[PDB]
Structures are given as C-alpha cells and as structure tokens.
Design an enzyme around this catalytic site. Structure first.
Site, mmCIF file in Angstrom:
data_model
loop_
_atom_site.group_PDB
_atom_site.id
_atom_site.type_symbol
_atom_site.label_atom_id
_atom_site.label_comp_id
_atom_site.label_asym_id
_atom_site.label_seq_id
_atom_site.Cartn_x
_atom_site.Cartn_y
_atom_site.Cartn_z
ATOM 1 N N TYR A 134 0.844 -1.191 0.000
ATOM 2 C CA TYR A 134 0.000 0.000 0.000
ATOM 3 C C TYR A 134 0.877 1.237 0.000
ATOM 4 O O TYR A 134 1.492 1.575 1.009
ATOM 5 C CB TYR A 134 -0.916 -0.048 1.235
ATOM 6 C CG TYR A 134 -1.794 1.169 1.520
ATOM 7 C CD1 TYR A 134 -2.111 2.097 0.530
ATOM 8 C CD2 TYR A 134 -2.320 1.373 2.798
ATOM 9 C CE1 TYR A 134 -2.924 3.188 0.810
ATOM 10 C CE2 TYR A 134 -3.128 2.450 3.082
ATOM 11 C CZ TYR A 134 -3.426 3.351 2.089
ATOM 12 O OH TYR A 134 -4.238 4.420 2.374
ATOM 13 N N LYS A 162 -1.434 -1.217 -4.262
ATOM 14 C CA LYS A 162 -2.478 -0.209 -4.131
ATOM 15 C C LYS A 162 -1.769 1.158 -4.261
ATOM 16 O O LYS A 162 -1.153 1.651 -3.304
ATOM 17 C CB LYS A 162 -3.217 -0.297 -2.813
ATOM 18 C CG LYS A 162 -4.362 0.706 -2.748
ATOM 19 C CD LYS A 162 -4.722 1.019 -1.310
ATOM 20 C CE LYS A 162 -5.867 2.009 -1.203
ATOM 21 N NZ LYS A 162 -6.047 2.244 0.214
#
Lengths: 291, 292, 291, 292
Positions: A134, A162
């Site tokens: 992330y 992400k």
C-alpha cells in the site's frame, strides 16, 4: 483474481465512539448490493490508525462473517510496528480473508531494506495470503522510487499494489514493467485516467456511497465509450469536491446515514463533526445518489 | 481555434553556441511536415532562460518567416521582468504570432496580486494576441491554488492555460470550471490521461521528434480506441524514459541531429553534452522514428 | 522549574524485544547521575509509536518509581488518537509525573481546530499536569504557523514547548512572543545556537550518553564563554554525525551497552540492527565518553 | 581578507524603473559611512535577475568607482547561463572588484558536475578574483548536499561560501570541515546563531539600514557578551518582522528613501509598491535608526 473495484470500508462508531456493529454489517451488505468486487477492510478509510489491534481484529472478524465467500476480502494489516502487523496478518488468515495489505511503516524514518523486511515478516505471518503493498506518500511521508516500487512489488508473496499516487506516468511505468500485476488506483478523483494509465482496478473510500459509478467507468472504458466514462468521473469529482470540504470520512458517513446505513455518522476524535452548513448538500446528495 | 497539439520548439545552436538559423528553419519545417497543429516558441524547451531578449526575438522572427500562416504560432514571451516580457509581447505581435504566453515569474517570490498585474501588463503589450498562462510548478516553484488558477485563467485577454502539472484531478476541476477554456497538457508522459481528464490538446518538447503519435492518441480517443491510445502512450513513454536519462533537450536535439535536422545537438552551458554511452539508443531511436 | 536539559528516554528491549526493566531502571539512574534536569519519557526516542498503550504505561510507572522526586518528569502521552492520549495522560497523573506532553496528531491531516481541541482533551485528562506542546514537523508532517504555534502555546494548560525545528528565526520569534515560556530546543545538533536564539532548555535523545556536555554548553553561555560552548557543541556534533550514520536510537543503545547500562541495544522492528562496521567506532565512543 | 560583515547592496531605480545612478552612489557612500566591511553587488538583493547584463555591468562599474578600495567589493556575476556569468565575471575584474560570486544556476535542473564546471568557467573568467560560492536553496531551488558543498568549496578558485541557509547543523559541519573557510551567514534573522555555529561573518540585505547592529553582535560575541548579542539580534528581528510584512527590498528602499539616501523607493515590476498602510511604521523606523 484480485482485480476489481473494491470499497475501502469505513468503520461506523456509536455516540460513545465505539464500533456500531449493527451499522458495520449494514454497510458490508450495502456495499455488496451495489455490485462492488470486494472490500478492503481496516485501511486509512477505516480509521485503523485511531484504533487498537483488538478493535481492528474485531472489525476484521465481523466483516468476514458478513462477507466471506460473497466478495473478495482484503485486510489492511498495516501498523508502524512489524510485530503488530503480523498479529493482524495472522488474524486475517484465521478469519479467512483473501489477501492481506499493509501501508509502508511511517513516522519513524526507515531504510528501504527495513521496508522490504517489514513486508516479508507480514507476508510470512499472513500464511499464504497474497500481499497488497500500500503506497500513499501523501499520508505516509514515504517517497519510494520506481525501482523500490518494482522491488517491493516483486517480493515473494506480494500479489498486488495499491497505488495512491496521482502520478500517472509512474502508474504506467509500473504497468509496463509488470503486465500481470494487479494495480489499484488509489485516488478516486482520477480513477478513469488511472485506468487509462495502466490500472486494472481501484480501492477507494468514496465507493462506499457510489461504487456503481466506478464500475460504470470500468465498463465504459472497456466498451470504448470514453464519453460516458468522463461523465462518470466528473460526477464522481463533484462529490469529491464536496466531501473534501465537509471532511471525507465524516462526510461519507453523513451520506450513508441519510441512506439509512450508518446510525451515527461520527469519526473518532481528533476528527470533529461535519459543519452543520454542509448537512443540506449531504442530505441532498444522499437522496440524489439513491439512483 | 488555438486548441490542438503544439510542439515546444527547441533552439539549435552551433559549435559556438550561437543560434543555428539553418537548423532552426529545418526544425520548423520538419515539425510542420510532421503534421503538428502549431508551435510554442521560446519556452523552456527553446532554452529561453539561457538566451537574451534579442536572441529570443531573433528566434521569433525566423520561425514567423517560416511558419506564419501555415500553422499556429504561440510566442512564449515571459521573463522574470514584466518590462522584458512586454517588449517580447510587442515583438510577437509585430512578427504576427497568434497568441502570446508567459511563465509565472520566478526566483523571487511574488504575491498573487503581483502575478495578476504581471499578466495584465503583458496582455496589454500583446495588443490583441491571446494569453496562454504557463503553469509549471516544478520549474518556476510557483505553487498556485485552483482559485488563483481560476482567477488568472479568467483574466480578460487570457485564451488558454498550459497546464504543466501531473495533478489530473486539478486538470478536470479546471475543465469543469472553464468548459470553453483551451487546456494544454504539459506533461507528455501523461498525455492520454491528461486528455481523458479534460485537457483538449497539448504543448510539449518530445512532439519535435514523434509528434504524429500525439496526434494519433488524440484521434484514437476520439474514435473510442483506448487500445491504440494506450499503445501510443507507452511507446511515447519509453522514448521519454530514455530522454529523461540522457537529458530531454539535448536528447531530442541529438535524435534530430540523426534525422538530419540539427547540425550540432548541444544545449547551452551549464548544460553538458549527452553521455556517449547513450548514443547507441539515440541513433536507434532516430532510426525507428524515421522508419515509422 | 520545568526549565532545563531533559533527556529523552530510550526504552531498552530484550532479545525477545520485550521491555528490559533491568536496563530501563539502569538507564533512568544512569541519566540521573549524569546531572540531567529530568527525563522526557515515552516520546519519539522512547519508541512510543511502536509500543502499545499498556507497554507505554508500564514504562511510565517504572521510571516514575525510579525517579519520582529525584528529577523532573515529563510523560510524552501522545498518539494519533485523542482518547489513547487522554488515557496515557490520566496514567501520567496517577503515576505522579510533573507534566504531560504530546506530538501533534500525525498521519491523517487534521485541522488546526482539531489539533487545538485534541490538546484540550488531553490537558483535561492530565488533571492539573501542564502540557508541553511537541513541535516536530520533520516527523509529524504537520507544519504549524507562528500564529498557530502561538495559539497552541497559550492554550489553558500549556506550560512549555518542545521546538523540534531548526528554524532559529522562529525560535527567537517564539521567545519574543512569550518571554516567560519554557522553550525546549529539540535538535541536539544546534543546541548552543538554539539557546542563543531563545530556548531556555532542551529535550534530546543524545543526552543519554553525554548529558553533561549539554549542561556544559548552558553554563558556558551563561558565563559568557561561547568559545567553550562552541567547543562543546562541535564535540556533540561529531557524536551526532556518527549516530545519524549508524542510526540514532540503535547507535545510542549500543554506546550505552558498551557503557554497561543497556543489555541488548535493540530497537523494535521495523527498525534493524547497527551494521557491524560501526561497532569499533561506537565502542571507542563509549570508552572516550566514560573516560 | 574577505571575512567580515558586508552589505548586499540594493539598486535604486527612478520613477520610470531605470537605474538611479545618483542614489546608487549615495547608497554606496552611506553603507561605507556605516562602517560595513565591504559590499556585495548584483546579488538577489540588487534585483539582478530583473536586470540585463549591461545594466548589471553599469551598477558594478559605478560602485567600483565609488568604492575606490575604501571597502571590500564582491561582484555577484551569476546568471543561469555560464557564458553570461563569465562576461559579468570578466567585467568585474576589469572594474577591479576584489572577488566574484555566483548562485547555483536555477530554473533548469542541472547536475552537480554541471554546477562544478559552471563555477570553474566563471572562476576562469574572473582571472584571479576568488569565487564566493553562493548557496540559497530557498530561492534557487537547488538542494546541494554537504559533500557537494565541500567539493565546491575546495574547487580551485573558490575562496568563500555565502551560506543562505537556516540549517545551523550544516553550518557547524562546514566550519568543522573547513576551519579556515570564509563562511558568510546569509539569513540576517539568525546572524547571532549562525556566527555561534561557525559562520565568520555575513552578507545581508538589511545591512543597508543597520549594518552597525550586525557589527555589534560580532563584537559582543567576541567579548563574550551574549546578553547584548541577543538584544541586538531581537532588535534586528523586530525590523525583519516588518520588512517581511512589507516586502524586504521595497521596505529597505523605503526606509533609505526616508533617510534621504534613495530618491524613489521602487523595485522593478513584477515587484509592486509598498502598501500605504505600512508607511507609518517605515517612517518611524527610518526615524529611530537615524536617531540611533
């Protein structure tokens, strides 16, 4: 099989600022019924960093009971502490999530090897569950290079990225380097362009209230109808303009509340409540979203 | 009217680092021949900030001789000085340029009011030619808000905005707010994404060597072909990847030198020459582009 | 009274990364014998953000027990959560600390009103304990403005300011605005210069291995001997140059190990070890300092 | 011999934005009579980037005249262009300045080697005048590292470093690394703190109106009188607080105008005039400094 449009789930609290399990369930189901591909639980959107492990574990367990099997479930396990994240990774595996995710540990400055080793440990504790690195420099303060991004993304056990960066030149470099990688567009404001750049999906918090639009943009771009794709993106941005004014997490909760999903649209302090003046536009948007 | 794909023209120098009038003329024609919509002359890409007002005017005059009437010509007229830009603004008018443009004055931190008065003064001296506000936070270090941008973009006399920023959320807010504004995408690397966001054309340096690809991405998006649109952008991105390693101006000039357009591919000091190790890739690039 | 040179306490962990009480207590007293004005416990240097609340409290109680009465005690009580902070504030009160402290809530962007209300909530819970506002933009990602710092510093309950900023223009501006404010210079590398600009003290992590130098500079500037002050500051910067090279927290723990104070010079992951190449340097450092 | 407190000279202009030679000379002598160690001309403070080379040469030439080896003279010769910088460096020697200076070339990002070659060439053109590397991250946007500063500082010809940075850890490290280096503190707001850290003097714009205060901090610290060192610094800061409020250059020219030194308190556009609301403070400030 992790490619898709996944809502970054909010965690509803009560007037005492304690989880409103009745609203959480109501929210998991609301999202499901709106055609989302899966849920990303315990992320920034879920006010995870203003929570305890047990709290995050609790939210994890409840959404799994509510949605395991129905949609893809991804657990955000990230903590600044590695040991803490592994604990959450361990519970995620145990609850039956499909993948695990983690922000780049922040606040303390860590070298890149420390970042890779941190992901390794979490990947380990995840027990087979693919990892979703992330990346959000704006909030984490961690500015990774493309090579570093490529190195992390190619770590064993890592199954997706992400990308919460509005740098769409990097979004495509990443895609050009890794044609098979599942890349999620993190910034809702630029979804359509993010996909055009190389993203094959997204994880965003505004999906909670209007995921069908994002899925609509996916279909439009898939059918070469950029005209409606654009239309969807501005509609989505008009909302984002508003939510950014009212405060995003709390504004989403106010809308969801007017949609009869969230009982008390409060975020946990430091966050304050929405300015009452914004209430009418939110009420209005809730009603209008009912489309 | 000013909408479209405009190449940010480079300025060719000789071994003495003086202007190479012949190569400059070759460059204008090469761009014209390659089907560009217009030319943005004397911008960052033209090495404006490392040349004098006279050196700058001389270039405006020459490309006007060559391109006027055949394509749009926008004269980048900005300097840190309002007085210097006014002078250049006046010449662009005299030479017959279609519009005028100026970066937000740099080095010294100026207020927003001062930025507005700088533009009003220049527009005044443009005596009719529309102003294209040039926003490049990365080089000018001038970080304008969307409100300031809306104010500037609506200043009487401003016809377009050259958005050199990768913030595609801002790109669409600007469009949502100025549906009729001529919006130029500044970063080539995100050309396709920038157009999808709201830009309606572009101005850039790499257009000098593969401008037809940008025209291509434009048509594809028009005909709903996101496949060739994306295909086109990745092929532009591998070139940009190289140029970013080698130096864009010097890298583009070097390819141009291989396409037999530019005599000496050197930029002005402090720019150093391209690293010899990169030449194999540059020649090869020049070959494929020449072939396509 | 809260004025002075205060060491920012390191928390000694064992091989299993659990609190090493033996070493903690040893570090507390070690710091005391150094003639330090007090201890700032549970802050950035204490690895607060990689510990849990309970762990933080445990550490709080042990040092209170060890140094309550002997020296001044300030408990860094802050987290991103106002509630977590209050709880730790309530505990700082209970254990008998002299003051409370808190970094501006990081990661999520919070409004200045939000920040102010947050300090207010913690102050309330400190039950009479003065608040030391902690300004560390480099790490928090929060860049307040003078007027903002001014508002903060004047909140009812705020007793001092830990200024971890190298902006010595703002340092004199703060002292000019508040002639009676306890102003702590937060960056050891500019201690001497911080004091000449207005700070009436400092809270540093490096004070653990050479606190006497910092008290040395203070006395020298007081006696008008800037020549020695300077000589003392260059000495501290040679040390600081190395620590930044080896890693500050880990480097410090290693020196204290060779100083027979801390058993295992480990920081908790994601942090990593000191590279072996630095041990002879850190070894030689502990020898000269204790010499 | 370049070590000391030296004023960054302002360049007076007339009502029509042209150099006001009379006030330049008047400003030179005033600074001299203020017991400043020398003058820095053509720098950021002198509005150089808003002037033309010949305009900068004119200024250099008039102050060299006035300056008749009465004080130390340093010529800021830097431009983005190496060639322009060279010409200016060559004129400065021609005029008899004691040293030459130059900022790290801005706007276009350059490599460290390109920066090193840049200084060398200029040094080369200075023909014996030592180089005072000018480091100002805040304005140039160039982020040099200590090791980069070290390399530059040891470069043959480099005789001083003008540290316009608030990082006093880095100031300490540079002095450490170079015990005999002429290190000028660039931010007046921290003069006292920068000296304590290792700067052996300073170059500043406010020296124009209260150079004696900075000479006083220097003496105070010499005699270990930190008490007066601090009063002098807060008095200087109270002043800077105001100048930042009004605009430093313009506020200075405004006070100097009230002291009948500068005829027209203007800066070339895009700098606008000083807000009328601030005149009462500048009027009073010119009074107390005079009274002082």
């Amino acid at each position: 099989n992790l490619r898709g449009v996944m809502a970054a789930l909010l965690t509803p609290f009560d007037q005492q600022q304690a989880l409103d399990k009745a609203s959480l369930r109501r929210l998991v189901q609301f999202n499901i019924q709106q055609g989302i591909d899966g849920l990303y639980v315990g992320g920034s959107t879920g006010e995870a960093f203003v929570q305890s492990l047990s709290e995050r574990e609790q939210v994890l367990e409840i959404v799994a009971e509510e949605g395991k099997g129905k949609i893809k479930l991804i657990a955000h396990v990230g903590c600044v502490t590695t040991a803490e994240s592994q604990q959450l990774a361990a519970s995620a595996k145990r609850y039956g999530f499909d993948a695990v995710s983690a922000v780049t540990p922040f606040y303390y400055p860590f070298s890149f090897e420390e970042h890779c080793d941190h992901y390794r440990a979490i990947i380990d504790s995840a027990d087979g569950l693919p990892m979703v690195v992330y990346n959000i420099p704006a909030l984490s303060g961690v500015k990774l290079t493309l090579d570093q991004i490529n190195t992390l993304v190619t770590l064993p056990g890592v199954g997706a990225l992400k990308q919460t960066s509005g740098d769409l030149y990097q979004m495509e470099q990443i895609r050009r380097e890794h044609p098979d990688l599942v890349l999620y567009n993190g910034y809702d404001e630029i979804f359509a362009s993010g996909l055009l750049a190389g993203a094959d999906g997204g994880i965003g918090s505004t999906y909670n209230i209007m995921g069908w639009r994002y899925q609509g943009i996916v279909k439009a771009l898939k059918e070469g109808d950029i005209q409606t794709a654009q239309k969807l993106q501005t509609e989505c941005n008009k909302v984002i303009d508003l939510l950014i004014k009212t405060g995003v997490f709390r504004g989403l909760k106010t809308v969801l509340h007017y949609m009869d999903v969230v009982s008390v649209p409060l975020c946990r302090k430091p966050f304050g409540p929405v300015d009452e003046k914004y209430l009418p536009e939110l009420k209005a948007l809730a009603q209008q979203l009912m489309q």
